[PDB]
UniProtKB/Swiss-Prot annotation, chain C:
Gene3D superfamilies reported for this sequence: 3.10.50.40
EC number(s) recorded for this UniProt protein: 5.2.1.8
Entry keywords, A to Z: Cytoplasm, Isomerase, Rotamase, Sarcoplasmic reticulum
Lineage: Eukaryota, Metazoa, Chordata, Craniata, Vertebrata
One Pfam assignment: FKBP_C
Catalytic activity: [protein]-peptidylproline (omega=180) = [protein]-peptidylproline (omega=0)
One biological process term in Gene Ontology: release of sequestered calcium ion into cytosol
GO CC aspect terms: calcium channel complex; cytoplasm; membrane; sarcoplasmic reticulum membrane; Z disc
Cell location: Cytoplasm; Sarcoplasmic reticulum
UniProt name for this protein: Peptidyl-prolyl cis-trans isomerase FKBP1B
PANTHER family assigned to the protein according to its UniProt record, in alphabetical order: PEPTIDYL-PROLYL CIS-TRANS ISOMERASE, PEPTIDYL-PROLYL CIS-TRANS ISOMERASE FKBP1B
UniProtKB/Swiss-Prot annotation, chain D:
Full protein name: Calmodulin-1
GO biological process annotation, one example: regulation of cardiac muscle contraction by regulation of the release of sequestered calcium ion
Binding residue positions for Ca(2+) 1: D21, D23, D25, T27, E32
Protein source organism: Homo sapiens (Human)
Modified-residue entries (Phosphothreonine), positions: T45, T107
Gene that specifies this protein: CALM1
From Swiss-Prot, chain E:
Protein name: Ryanodine receptor 2
Record's comment on post-translational modification: Channel activity is modulated by phosphorylation. Phosphorylation is increased in failing heart, leading to calcium leaks and increased cytoplasmic Ca(2+) levels.
Implicated disorder: Ventricular tachycardia, catecholaminergic polymorphic, 1, with or without atrial dysfunction and/or dilated cardiomyopathy: An arrhythmogenic disorder characterized by stress-induced, bidirectional ventricular tachycardia that may degenerate into cardiac arrest and cause sudden death. Patients present with recurrent syncope, seizures, or sudden death after physical activity or emotional stress. CPVT1 inheritance is autosomal dominant.
Location(s), subcellular: Sarcoplasmic reticulum membrane
Gene: RYR2
Subunit record text: Homotetramer. Can also form heterotetramers with RYR1 and RYR3. Interacts with FKBP1A and FKBP1B; these interactions may stabilize the channel in its closed state and prevent Ca(2+) leaks. Interacts with CALM and S100A1; these interactions regulate channel activity. Identified in a complex composed of RYR2, FKBP1B, PKA catalytic subunit, PRKAR2A, AKAP6, and the protein phosphatases PP2A and PP1. Interacts directly with FKBP1B, PKA, PP1 and PP2A. Interacts with SELENON. In cardiac muscles, identified in a complex, composed of FSD2, CMYA5 and RYR2.
Length: 355, 780, 107, 142, 378
């Protein structure tokens, strides 16, 4: 309106008219974001290699058992912190940093040769073994269990570390993860998974309309990417990719344990929870289409929102496919008696009209 | 006292007595610290420091007592600002460089010229013959040069003794020999008493080879116990913080000249277009965007030196200065056989310690690994410290020091239980900050220091201590809420940051709503000031925050006020006093900059119609007399003294007629401000028409006309000639009729001459005729 | 309300006069013999301007009756030393204070 | 709002208020605050004294003092602005305002969305291509 | 919501009622019911639809029953009849009867599943369906109706073994302690010592068993086992707190402090009672300290009784235990540190004067100064 146009142009003073200290203060905050935040150096693979090295321990005259190397000590500390009972999973700088360091240590990332691809697979396996041989596979389960269904950066790093150690459908890590759960009878792990699914966000049409009005009327976009509609798409994608990795390779044991837990006191149906979230995200996508149906052109703010929603929907569909691929009659018949059809019938309408 | 090595009961009792001495003066109890100087003297607290035959428990108790009495307050005050960098813009500051000379080799950490503002170190002389009351501020004084010399000598001797692995450590164990002595050294280094040669000498004891300024094994290579290792990790972390501070001062030193050159270049580039725009009009259009862009964006797009996309207008000779400074800074941070650097030394020591043995202390493991992470992430320290950096000119240095002292005093009572003696201190601290001009000049510095969060936490503690058991320290809540409201009124970004605490402020929103004269000093008032006249913040409001206020207002309109009925006010079935305050916040939420927020008004109206108890007992519908009959009952209650008072001025007596009138002037004010703007109704929006229809059905037109037609009370002249004017806050007010006009205009509207003339003749002519007669000399 | 043993004689010729800073080096002990204050412990001469309500009554009068360079013992009754309330945490209520005072300089 | 004020001028309002010092509350009354405007120079009417006092006791604190005179000193702002009108463009002296020079105006300051600039011709009434410097920003509001 | 009985309002007369309550009751012990089949052999078999059974309230030892006036009311074992105490689980509200089914001899067929299955409680004889009154935490009264309402489905959640054992220990301890309190009251009212029964060997054994039960884990255990044992201890402490079993120990201590010494106790009581008086006082104080050690909620609920505890600190027979309880409360609850006043601090200080040099008094004084990093200046 009237206020915005007139006061900016004339009351606005160029940078050279500002006092020196104010301009220096502006520079100190601009320089950070432009250079310091945009400076990247890769040290994770060397740090972890150095941390996993037993330093002169066999040469040391210990006359005792094999000492745990610094990486093992770090993983044991992080696992003990999670295993300690608390009301809430407390925010941890050290865990957040190191769960990213060890996650980045396992990936190191026209048609490559077969030898090159097998080189990359063997290196992947060795890098994942560097971690899951020191107890990292049981630590990511304990952290998720201690999360108690609360979304946060503490879980957003645990789920990425689990993905890093499970990439490629690692059968050894899958077996370790299943053995730990079956031995400890951890109901909290599945309860926290159900809670995280229930806390996963979807498309918010009201928030989108409010943001669109705010941008259109001229009020400054406070955040860079408008990450209030579909609040955490990356977290949801990681959460469902973790579950897909848990069953990749037609793992009939996880495929049956995620549905029913035989040894546990109580059972949570992750298969049904996944399809419930799929139905919710379908109901969000359908409404977000219905908003744009009358409009001729979809703007970029809408196009990127559709992209973020479709990525999540694709990941959930892939996870559901991995739940049932191979003969898995329990999972197939559990999805056959759920609200899966109510989501497919709406996705079909969206596909028929939007296409 | 050396006979206690064989008497284990007196030894234990005296150790616990020393612990009680340390506890009674804990966390800045200076009055008790001065009193403890009469029981443990300085000669005693030097003899126990230096004695080698003392029991280990007594040695550790006495090192802890010395620090707690004398060196615990300033060390904590300095640690609370160790993560904050306020670098004055001075000539000595401008002379700081990253490296001492052309040879880009790191200097010894700590040694150098540092100009960042620092907490003041002041001590009071203990004396029990003086009768002054000014000595109970500041810790008791101690000889800090004798303490430095003794600490250095003892640390050297302990290093020499431990390397030989003797069977007689001081105190009986290496733990009793090193842990408390290293704690004292660490406290002294934290306080910063060591200077130049002393720090150079002690860095050689820490690591003789790395700190060899240009056989003997320092503390880092001594096969230390785990508690010793923990304190060495703390010392190394402080050493790293010293390097971070030097790196972050050297950035400001370069930034002065860089910003000067950038501003000169921008002025030159502006003039070179101002005198040459007639050459080409097209180029000026895309050249004046920088001069019309906000100052932050100007420098953000001037700082695109990196990469090769290179659309910044800054020339190459200014490019290659920042490009070289950044490379030198990365070299300093370590981002490219002998370590020759603190970073490499720590990175080696931590790994070597972890691989020599299994550490049994989780705290030691955590401290070891958080230090290794710091060493391997040198760029991650700058990204955390630079936001906490603010530069001030030379004239403001003393004022900023005073503000920082007041803030440190405010911060220091976050670790004490709030009481009468703390109420005065912090009211004084808040008042000094308010009377401090930097608080207004530099809101960004204030926000970076996070005083709003500190006051938030203090008021949280006060509310927790006395929420269910009636509010304690209401003057604290009042001062804290006034401070936070002024903080919102300072700047728009302050209001945005204060908006982030809306959830808690709505949680504790009934703190002092019914307390008279405590208006503008309530967490609900802070919540309202966090969204007042901010369109972006009002549109950022969520519904869950909105149902909370509606629930509270429904509870108020359904429930009576225990405190008022306990003071004796007549027990009606609702809360007119508390309801108006909840209605005011909704007013501020739905109305912004003279226009209704269409995404909040439509939610508020729906919530209020879902909960019809929010409309007051007279607009329920079942048995309600309406609105005109509702505010004519109040215009009789306010005159009946047995129904308007507590039945045995305004701060002590709530007027029960004026409260109902204010409630029924705030509800209609909110409902009229929730009416849609007429451009939407003219365009024919169905939701806007529906909302207007609901609002119009809620209040009849006659109930609005009658209230306007209600007469006023004119002041009268007595036989003396003195003006006998009835109290404003006890009767029907003109401000109470301002809501009826707004509602009748925004919801009903005036569109027909007949109704316009009717409304005039019945309600406006009496008011104008009674006001034009008040234009006399005394009644003006 | 305070008498005075001299412990070491002074000049006997110069006495503190009004508005003059008195520099003393004192040690104060309770009646039972327990020390509670000593400027010698802090290694610092104690300075106070006479007649000016900076120190307690008894110390004030004892230093006034003192001569330059003298060493004397001051006995302060409770009425002229902290009264019946006492000094919190240091001096018990109704305590007689004994001071070992030396007047180093007058300024 | 501190955007209307500047760190430069906000100083003088402090030393003027520091003339009575003593933590602000003391000796700052209705008559006392009537004297601080006398240091600045502006000469408010007697009605203009208590009409503002009651809008926010006698004792006026500095945050109250700043929040008061902030709203009323946003004034005489065209005394410097009138110089700015003829300096931004069109120094050729012919006195004909070109439409091409008007293209610097549309530049959305936070919107980055076009085709409403064309409406800026539409809302400009052709009442006698030529639009005066001060007038182009004036008739649209109030 | 959970079908439970009123909390410890000191009256079994109104605790004998049932209702629906939600919130934190679902993890308490008064919402626990034991299903007892009407057969002695194969009583641990799978419960089938239409199988008669009794419902027992664990913390009260009383059975769900239907009154003459068609009311739900808990009553005692000696009065619990099959005619009054008999309920069945049926799949639906169908009016068809289950009929006479032959009694199996074995585990049987798994019919009712925990949680997933939906059960409907119906009286065996009257055939009435168990429904709520639907009118006024919640206090939704549970009554008996001819057909009930449509939302009358009840699922089943199986209690943990530790939870059930703690719930039964609660009853077994409260019964004995009530007997002991009644005996002490009779002795105070001057009943003959032989006529009145004082359970004192049973009380000593129970007080030893309870302290063994509330034993903090030893430091040699592995981390996971230690944390599991800490969790079990926390659950036991919470369950005993929610049943008002702290106040029962307090009542026992208060009623046993009416006697100055062992001889004074043995004058009114016997001597097999007499030599077991100091031991019972010490065991009660140790149990009180164990029921609250490490539990912030238990220590915070003790703030009101903190004043009463300090009133007996000067007693020689109670000083050590009272000081231990005081230290346990102060180290945990910031809220109980606000209750301590000048008189309490002076009493603790005079304890040093009258008892000697005890470092445990200095420890309590240290705890009085700083709690959880917050210093109390007063």
């Amino acid at each position: 309106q009237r206020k915005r146009a007139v006061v900016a142009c004339f009351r606005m003073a160029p940078l050279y008219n500002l006092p020196r200290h104010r301009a220096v203060n502006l520079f100190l905050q601009g320089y950070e974001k432009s250079w310091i935040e945009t400076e990247e150096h890769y040290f994770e693979d060397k740090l972890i290699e150095d941390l996993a090295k037993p330093g002169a321990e066999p040469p040391e005259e210990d006359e005792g058992t094999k000492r745990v190397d610094p990486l093992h000590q770090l993983i044991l500390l992080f696992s003990r912190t999670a295993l300690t009972e608390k009301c809430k999973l407390e925010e941890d700088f050290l865990y957040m940093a190191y769960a990213d360091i060890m996650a980045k240590s396992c990936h190191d990332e026209e048609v490559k040769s077969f030898e090159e691809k097998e080189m990359e697979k063997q290196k992947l396996l060795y890098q994942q073994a560097r971690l899951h041989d020191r107890g990292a596979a049981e630590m990511v389960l304990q952290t998720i269990s201690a999360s108690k269904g609360e979304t946060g950066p503490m879980v957003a790093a645990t789920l990425k570390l689990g993905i890093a150690i499970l990439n490629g459908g690692n059968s050894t890590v899958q077996q370790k993860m299943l053995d730990y759960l079956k031995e400890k009878k951890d109901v909290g792990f599945f309860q926290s998974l159900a809670g995280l699914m229930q806390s996963c966000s979807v498309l918010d049409l009201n928030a989108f309309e409010r943001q669109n009005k705010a941008e259109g009327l001229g009020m400054v976009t406070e955040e860079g990417s408008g990450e209030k509609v579909l609040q955490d798409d990356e977290f949801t994608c990681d959460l469902f990719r973790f579950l897909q990795l848990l069953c990749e390779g037609h793992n009939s044991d996880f495929q049956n344990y995620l549905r029913t837990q035989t040894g546990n006191n109580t059972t949570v149906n992750i298969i049904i929870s996944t399809v419930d979230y799929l139905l919710r995200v379908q109901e969000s996508i359908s409404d977000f289409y219905w908003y744009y149906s009358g409009k001729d052109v979809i703007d970029e703010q809408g196009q990127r929102n559709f992209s973020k929603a479709i990525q999540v929907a694709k990941q959930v569909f892939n996870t559901l496919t991995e739940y049932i691929q191979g003969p898995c009659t329990g999972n197939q018949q559990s999805l056959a008696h759920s609200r899966l059809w109510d989501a497919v019938v709406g996705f079909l309408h969206v596909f028929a009209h939007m296409q | 006292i050396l006979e206690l090595t064989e008497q284990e009961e007196l030894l234990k009792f005296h150790y616990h007595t020393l612990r009680l001495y340390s506890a009674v003066c804990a966390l800045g109890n200076h009055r008790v610290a001065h009193a403890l100087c009469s029981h443990v003297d300085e000669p005693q607290l030097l003899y126990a420091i230096e004695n080698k035959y003392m029991p280990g428990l007594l040695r550790a108790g006495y090192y802890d007592l010395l620090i707690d009495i004398h060196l615990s307050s300033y060390a904590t005050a300095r640690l609370m600002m160790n993560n904050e960098y306020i670098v004055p813009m001075t000539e000595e500051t401008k002379s700081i460089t990253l490296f001492p000379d052309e040879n880009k080799k790191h200097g010894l950490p700590g040694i150098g010229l540092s100009t960042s503002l620092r907490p003041r170190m002041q001590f009071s002389s203990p004396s029990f013959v003086s009768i002054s009351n000014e000595c109970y501020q500041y810790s008791p004084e101690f000889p800090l040069d004798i303490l430095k010399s003794k600490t250095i000598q003892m640390l050297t001797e302990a290093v020499k003794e431990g390397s030989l692995h003797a069977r007689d450590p001081v105190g009986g164990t290496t733990e009793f020999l090193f842990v408390p002595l290293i704690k004292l050294f660490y406290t002294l280094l934290i306080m910063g008493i060591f200077h130049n040669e002393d720090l150079k000498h002690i860095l050689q004891l820490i690591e003789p080879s790395v700190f060899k300024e240009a056989p003997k094994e320092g503390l880092l290579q001594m096969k230390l116990p785990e508690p010793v290792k923990l304190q060495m990790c703390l010392l190394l972390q402080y050493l790293c913080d010293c390097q971070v501070r030097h790196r972050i001062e050297a950035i400001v030193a370069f930034s002065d000249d860089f910003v000067a050159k950038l501003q000169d270049n921008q002025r030159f580039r502006y003039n070179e277009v101002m005198q040459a725009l007639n050459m080409s009009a097209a180029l000026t259009a895309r050249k004046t965007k920088e001069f019309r862009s906000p100052p932050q964006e100007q420098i953000n797009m001037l700082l695109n030196f990196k990469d090769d996309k290179s659309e910044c207008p800054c020339p190459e000779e200014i490019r290659d200065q920042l490009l070289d400074f950044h490379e030198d800074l990365m070299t300093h941070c370590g981002i490219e056989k002998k370590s020759s650097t603190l970073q490499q030394l720590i990175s080696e020591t931590m790994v070597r310690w972890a691989q020599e043995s299994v550490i049994e202390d989780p705290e030691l493991v955590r401290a070891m690994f958080v230090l290794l992470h710091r060493q391997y992430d040198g760029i991650g320290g700058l990204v955390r410290a630079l936001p906490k950096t603010y530069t001030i000119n030379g004239v403001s240095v003393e004022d900023t020091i005073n503000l920082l002292a007041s803030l440190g005093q405010i911060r220091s009572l976050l670790s004490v239980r709030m009481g009468k003696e703390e109420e005065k201190l912090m009211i004084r601290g808040l008042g000094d900050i308010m009377n401090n001009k930097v608080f207004y000049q530099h809101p960004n510095l204030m926000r970076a220091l996070g005083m709003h969060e500190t006051v938030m936490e203090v008021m949280v503690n006060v509310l927790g201590g006395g929420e269910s058991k009636e509010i304690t320290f209401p003057k604290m809540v009042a001062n804290c809420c006034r401070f936070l409201c002024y903080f919102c009124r300072i700047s728009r970004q302050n209001q945005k940051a204060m908006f982030d605490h809306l959830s808690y402020l709505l949680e504790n929103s009934s703190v002092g709503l019914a307390s008279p004269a405590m208006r503008g000093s309530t967490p609900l008032d802070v919540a309202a000031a966090s969204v007042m006249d901010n369109n972006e913040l009002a549109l950022a409001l969520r519904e869950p925050d909105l149902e909370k206020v509606v629930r509270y207002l429904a509870g108020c309109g359904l429930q009576s006020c225990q405190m008022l009925v306990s003071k004796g006010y007549p027990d009606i079935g609702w809360n007119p006093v508390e309801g108006e305050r909840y209605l005011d916040f909704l007013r501020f939420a739905v109305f912004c900059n003279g226009e209704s927020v269409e995404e909040n008004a439509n939610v508020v109206v729906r919530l209020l119609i879902r909960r019809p108890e929010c409309f007051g007992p007279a607009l329920r519908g079942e048995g309600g007399n309406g609105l005109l009959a509702a505010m004519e009952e109040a215009i009789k209650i306010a005159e009946d003294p047995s129904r308007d008072g507590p039945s045995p001025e305004e701060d002590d007596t709530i007027h029960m007629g004026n409260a109902i009138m204010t409630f029924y002037s705030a509800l209609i004010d909110l409902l009229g401000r929730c009416a849609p703007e007429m451009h939407l109704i003219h365009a024919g929006k169905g939701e806007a028409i529906r909302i207007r229809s609901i609002l119009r059905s809620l209040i009849p037109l006659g109930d609005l006309v009658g209230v306007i037609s209600i007469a006023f009370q004119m002041p009268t002249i007595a036989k003396d000639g003195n003006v006998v004017e009835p109290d404003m806050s006890a009767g029907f007010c003109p401000d109470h009729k301002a809501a009826m006009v707004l509602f009748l205009d925004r919801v009903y509207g005036i569109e027909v001459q007949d109704f316009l003339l009717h409304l005039l003749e019945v309600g406006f002519l009496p008011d104008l005729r009674a006001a034009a007669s008040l234009d006399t000399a005394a009644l003006s | 309300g305070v008498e005075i043993e001299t412990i070491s004689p002074g000049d006997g010729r110069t006495f503190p006069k009004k508005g003059q800073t008195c520099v003393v080096h004192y040690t104060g002990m309770l009646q039972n013999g327990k020390k509670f204050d000593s400027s010698r412990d802090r290694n610092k001469p104690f300075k106070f301007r006479i007649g000016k309500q900076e120190v307690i009554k008894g110390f004030e009068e004892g230093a006034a009756q003192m001569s330059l360079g003298q060493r004397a013992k001051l006995t302060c009754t409770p009425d002229v030393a902290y009264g019946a309330t006492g000094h919190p945490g240091v001096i018990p209520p109704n305590a007689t204070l004994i001071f070992d005072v030396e007047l180093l300089n007058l300024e | 709002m501190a955007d209307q004020l500047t760190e430069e001028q906000i100083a003088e309002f402090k030393e003027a208020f520091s003339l009575f010092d003593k933590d602000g509350d003391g000796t700052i009354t209705t008559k006392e605050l009537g004297t601080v405007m006398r240091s600045l120079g502006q000469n408010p009417t007697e009605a203009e004294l208590q009409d503002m006092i009651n809008e926010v006791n006698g004792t006026i604190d500095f945050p109250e003092f700043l929040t008061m005179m902030a709203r009323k000193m946003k004034d005489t702002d065209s005394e410097e602005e009138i110089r700015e009108a003829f300096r931004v463009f069109d120094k050729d002296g012919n006195g004909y305002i070109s439409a091409a020079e008007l293209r610097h105006v549309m530049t959305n300051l936070g919107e980055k969305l076009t085709d409403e600039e064309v409406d800026e011709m539409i809302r400009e009434a052709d009442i006698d291509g030529q639009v005066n410097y001060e007038e182009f920003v004036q008739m649209m509001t109030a | 919501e959970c079908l439970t009985v009123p909390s410890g309002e000191h009256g079994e007369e109104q605790r004998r009622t049932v209702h629906y309550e939600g919130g934190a009751v679902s993890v308490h012990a008064r919402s626990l019911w034991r299903l007892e089949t009407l057969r002695v052999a194969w009583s641990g078999s799978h419960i089938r639809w239409g199988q008669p059974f009794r419902l027992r309230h664990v913390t009260t030892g009383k059975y769900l029953s239907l009154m003459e006036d068609k009311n739900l009311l808990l009553m005692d074992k000696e009065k619990a009849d099959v005619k009054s105490t008999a309920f069945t689980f049926r799949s639906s509200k169908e009016k068809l009867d289950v009929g006479v089914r032959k009694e199996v001899d074995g585990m049987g067929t798994s019919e009712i599943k925990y949680g997933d299955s939906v059960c409907y409680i119906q009286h065996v004889d009257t055939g009435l369906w168990l429904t709520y009154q639907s009118v006024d935490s919640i206090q939704r009264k549970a009554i008996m109706h001819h057909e009930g309402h449509m939302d009358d489905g009840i699922s089943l959640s199986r209690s943990q073994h530790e939870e059930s054992r703690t719930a039964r220990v609660i009853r077994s301890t409260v019964f004995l302690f009530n007997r002991f309190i009644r005996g002490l009251d009779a002795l105070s009212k001057k009943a003959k010592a032989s006529t009145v029964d004082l359970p004192i060997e049973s009380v000593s054994l129970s007080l030893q068993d309870l302290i063994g039960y509330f034993h903090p884990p030893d430091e040699h255990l592995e981390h996971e086992d230690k944390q599991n044992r800490l969790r079990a201890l926390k659950n036991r402490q919470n369950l005993f707190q929610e049943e008002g079993m702290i106040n029962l120990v307090l009542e026992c201590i208060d009623r046993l402090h009416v006697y100055s010494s062992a001889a004074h106790f043995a004058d009114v009581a016997g001597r097999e009672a007499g030599e077991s008086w100091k031991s019972i006082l010490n065991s009660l104080y140790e149990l009180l300290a164990a029921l609250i050690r490490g539990n912030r909620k238990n220590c915070a609920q003790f703030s009101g009784s903190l004043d009463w505890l300090i009133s007996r600190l000067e007693r020689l027979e109670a000083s050590s235990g009272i000081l231990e309880v005081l230290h346990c409360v102060l180290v945990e609850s910031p809220e109980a540190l606000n209750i301590i006043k000048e008189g309490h601090i002076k009493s603790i200080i005079s304890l040093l004067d009258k008892h000697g040099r005890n470092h445990k008094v200095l420890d309590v004084l240290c705890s009085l100064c700083v709690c959880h990093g917050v210093a109390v200046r007063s």
